[PDB]
Amino acid sequence: RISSSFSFGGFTFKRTSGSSVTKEEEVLTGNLQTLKIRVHEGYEEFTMVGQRATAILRKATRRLIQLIVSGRNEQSIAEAIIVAMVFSQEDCMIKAVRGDLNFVNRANQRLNPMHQLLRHFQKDAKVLFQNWGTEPIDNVMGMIGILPDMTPSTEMSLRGVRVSK
Ligand SMILES: CN1CN([C@@H]2O[C@H](COP(=O)(O)OP(=O)(O)OP(=O)(O)O)[C@@H](O)[C@H]2O)c2nc(N)[nH]c(=O)c21
Numbered sequence: 001r002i003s004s005s006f007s008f009g010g011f012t013f014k015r016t017s018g019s020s021v022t023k024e025e026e027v028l029t030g031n032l033q034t035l036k037i038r039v040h041e042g043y044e045e046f047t048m049v050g051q052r053a054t055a056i057l058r059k060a061t062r063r064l065i066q067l068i069v070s071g072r073n074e075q076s077i078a079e080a081i082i083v084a085m086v087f088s089q090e091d092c093m094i095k096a097v098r099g100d101l102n103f104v105n106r107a108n109q110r111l112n113p114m115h116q117l118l119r120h121f122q123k124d125a126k127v128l129f130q131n132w133g134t135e136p137i138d139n140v141m142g143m144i145g146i147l148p149d150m151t152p153s154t155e156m157s158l159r160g161v162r163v164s165k
Pocket of ligand 1: 006007015040044087089114115
């Protein structure tokens with residue numbers, strides 16, 4: 001008895017537009033580790049629904065194109081942003097890695113590559129946020145910028161990212 005929604009990072013994803021195919025690709029992390037990832041190719045749109053935040057995300061092959069997040073505070077917002085940056089598969093995300101990706105669960109099972117990324121950045125996102133890039137923003141009604149330290153800005157924002165008012 002089957003929904004087309006899936007879970008990732010504690011968010012329920014639902015594709016609302018586009019399609020993708022996959023290819024496996026070896027990437028090099030910022031910690032000099034080689035990691036085999038399943039890369040999705042194609043333009044897609046998704047809704048994300050979590051317990052404390054919701055989002056809409058557009059992406060293409062290893063690119064976050066746009067993200068809008070709504071959340072009840074800075075931490076719930078940042079959790080949603082991290083999941084979307086990992087989910088995007090961006091090379092700047094892969095290059096912000098600073099530790100070994102050999103995490104296990106409480107059963108001694110190795111997390112899969114996408115979950116290794118998630119766990120790494122859920123533990124510390126500061127390099128992720130610093131290296132993602134920012135962009136000047138226009139005064140768009142209903143939307144506010146968010147800086148790399150997760151505080152609001154009407155002037156600049158993480159590249160491709162906005163927070164809904
Ligand atoms: C980046 N991804 C990840 N993903 C989906 O996100 C979910 C979690 O990703 P994952 O843990 O790597 O995939 P899973 O298939 O569980 O991994 P495993 O290889 O261990 O079986 C899966 O349903 C995967 O198909 C995606 N789905 C779509 N449509 N587009 C995308 O760009 C992405």
